[PDB]
UniProtKB/Swiss-Prot annotation, chain A:
Entry protein name: 26S proteasome regulatory subunit 4 homolog
Locations listed in the record: Cytoplasm; Nucleus
Covalent cross-link site, Glycyl lysine isopeptide (Lys-Gly) (interchain with G-Cter in ubiquitin): 182, 203, 238
Signal peptide range in chain numbering: none
GO cellular component term, pick one: proteasome regulatory particle, base subcomplex
Gene Ontology MF term list: ATP binding; ATP hydrolysis activity; proteasome-activating activity
Superkingdom in the source lineage: Eukaryota
UniProtKB/Swiss-Prot annotation, chain B:
Residues of the full protein shown: 52 to 152 of 405
Complexes and interactors: May form a homodimer or a heterodimer with a related family member. Interacts with OLA1, TMA17, and UBR1.
Post-translational modification (record): N-acetylated by NAT1.
Name this polypeptide is given: 26S proteasome regulatory subunit 8 homolog
Annotated family: Belongs to the AAA ATPase family.
Note: Present with 4700 molecules/cell in log phase SD medium.
Gene that specifies this protein: RPT6
Function, as annotated: The 26S proteasome is involved in the ATP-dependent degradation of ubiquitinated proteins. The regulatory (or ATPase) complex confers ATP dependency and substrate specificity to the 26S complex.
Curated annotation (Swiss-Prot), chain C:
Organism lineage string: Eukaryota, Fungi, Dikarya, Ascomycota, Saccharomycotina
Gene responsible for this protein: RPT3
Cellular compartment(s): Cytoplasm; Nucleus
Function: The 26S proteasome is involved in the ATP-dependent degradation of ubiquitinated proteins. The regulatory (or ATPase) complex confers ATP dependency and substrate specificity to the 26S complex.
Protein name: 26S proteasome regulatory subunit 6B homolog
Coiled coil spans: none
Included range, full protein: 144 to 214 of 428
Posttranslational mods: N-acetylated by NAT3.
Family membership noted in the UniProt record: Belongs to the AAA ATPase family.
Amino acid sequence: TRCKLKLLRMERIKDHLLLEEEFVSNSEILKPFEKKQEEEKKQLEEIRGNPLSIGTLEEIIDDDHAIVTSPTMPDYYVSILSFVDKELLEPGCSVLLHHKTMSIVGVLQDDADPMVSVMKMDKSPTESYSDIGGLESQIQEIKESVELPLTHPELYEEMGIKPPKGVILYGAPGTGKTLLAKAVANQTSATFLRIVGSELIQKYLGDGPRLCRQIFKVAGENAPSIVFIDEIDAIGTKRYDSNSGGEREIQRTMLELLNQLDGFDDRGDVKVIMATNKIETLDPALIRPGRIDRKILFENPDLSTKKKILGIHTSKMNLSEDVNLETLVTTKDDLSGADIQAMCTEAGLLALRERRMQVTAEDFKQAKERVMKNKVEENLEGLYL
Amino acid sequence: NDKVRFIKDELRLLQEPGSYVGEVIKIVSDKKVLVKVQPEGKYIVDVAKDINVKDLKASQRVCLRSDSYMLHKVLENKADPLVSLMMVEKVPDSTYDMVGG
Amino acid sequence: NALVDILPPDSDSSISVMGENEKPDVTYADVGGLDMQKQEIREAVELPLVQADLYEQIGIDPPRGVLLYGP
Amino acid sequence: LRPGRIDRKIEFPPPSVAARAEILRIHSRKMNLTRGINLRKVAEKMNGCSGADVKGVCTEAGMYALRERRIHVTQEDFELAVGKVMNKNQETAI
Amino acid sequence: GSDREVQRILIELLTQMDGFDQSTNVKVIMATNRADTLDPALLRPGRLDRKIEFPSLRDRRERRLIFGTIA
Ligand SMILES: Nc1ncnc2c1ncn2[C@@H]1O[C@H](COP(=O)(O)OP(=O)(O)OP(=O)(O)O)[C@@H](O)[C@H]1O
Ligand SMILES: Nc1ncnc2c1ncn2[C@@H]1O[C@H](COP(=O)(O)OP(=O)(O)OP(=O)(O)O)[C@@H](O)[C@H]1O
Ligand SMILES: [Mg+2]
């Protein structure tokens, strides 16, 4: 408070003074700016004038010439003049052309695209680690692969071992595969690209690889980056039948994803999170240990663990003193953590239909009973015993 | 008098340099605007000194005077994409009283 | 490109009103069955032109555009 | 259908004989009437299954008004309409 | 390019189909022998409204009627 304002007050009037000194004594000397400066800006503007025609640099020839394509049809063998970085002009780049006699007078253009914005999450999830009730061991296999080499890159470089690459979070539904991704995406504050696996099937032919080549290029540019692929199970199992390339198409796209993930490229820093619920379907080439390094696995929360999960959802909630948290845990016998969240949400909704702020013991008992009936047991382990 | 001063001088105004209609794609902080004349490509061109670049914003149909294509004025009508998709589907407004049953 | 004058609304039409003598020879007499269809389309196309008033009075929306599908 | 994924599930039964009467009245407010017509008795007689069908009884009644050049939607028109709408629906639905 | 030019023709038709309202004009009457390929943006209400059916099946009465007029 006292000292931060006090040092800023000295720095910001000392900055003022130095900028005045540089401005006065570089205007009276003609070798620096002065005479060249007041004529180049006015000339550069005036000579080329307007309209500046945008075009696309089709290709560049090493001799400061180029072949540029106007949308109006005529192509041109132009020259590359003043005020352009000649290494920045490459195929695909958009250039501004001098309309009287076609020469590249520069590129001033950001070229912002909806292709980079669609991958990008401006995420601010209220979730932080330790909104995961228990399953503490699993959290600390994920943080050692993704988050920790950004905090302390010292440990892996002292040891001499290359950081582990890639993870797959799989298990039963409701164990928080998505909830862990959100915790670890919040801390790192790396570029977090998100792309659901369903999107990689689209109707046209051969578009699958173009879409898959695009995602990883945005990521490699934005290192350090995370690419979370949600339910990559979806492309194997389903058959939307919009894509008229059939199953042959889905296979050729898959092979593209395999090359972008390691292959020949030698990309920058790109961690990958691959969430799935059924690892069987997934092509054995993808899961192969070399592209992914650690296969984290989850299981159905226990009776001791479910107390921790319940404590998180019941804290935010307002309660009467008549509630007993312990009788809601024991009745359910092996029910995931997704159901516990819905059981709290359902109770607060019953109390809001009765229009009383408190969530009493009865709203909990009606909600818990309704949620057990909605479920559907598991005829996988019923077969068994 | 307003009439006859206008008729005689009207012949010299009708040898117009023409005009064009573009649309603001995006602006930049050199006081210049990227506008698309529809049949052709796009052009980066500056505003006349009098209007501002603050007046101009997302997808305003703009006037141009064909010579340097100088932007002259915002046009009454705007073109916005989200209104046009809900218009072509065509769903008529309803009320709780119509549903009743 | 100054707008020096106007033209009529009937003019500068690529495709003009036929019927002078190109009107086809078929009539309701040559047509046979499909009696349900004849009645529908006469109610859809013919009755609104001759009598607009009937539709407003009764308070039904007039059938506007007509579509014909079939194999 | 997992717990917590949606939040509410609405079911719509086909309209009862009580509901049909209300729904048939909302469409009848737009067009003429005649004293003494019981919009309730036409809903019962119509077996039906949809409110789409119900709206078609009103439009078809207006078609029978044009052919005779009536001045008002009368009790005879609904009895003819019910039939035309029900017979057309049963030939395509069976 | 070919597709991008048809989209313009199809937008105009839809726009002026709602402008036709409150004229003596009866809207466009149009036929197609295909029904699966139609754009459903035409068959929304307020544009094309009435759908005519032409059957392929002929019962015994309706068949004699067609034979009668040709013969
Ligand atoms: N271990 C857990 N601790 C606390 N809350 C949990 C846990 N697991 C799930 N939840 C709650 O359930 C909600 C939904 O969970 P989530 O979307 O992660 O399920 P999932 O297992 O990813 O489902 P899917 O099989 O569809 O991927 C979370 O937002 C969270 O509130
Ligand atoms: N009800 C009928 N009475 C008399 N002749 C008929 C009848 N129906 C069809 N025809 C005969 O069949 C011919 C074929 O009819 P038309 O060419 O109009 O069929 P369409 O529905 O236009 O077929 P398309 O799908 O090729 O357009 C008619 O020119 C007519 O001679
Ligand atoms: Mg999930």
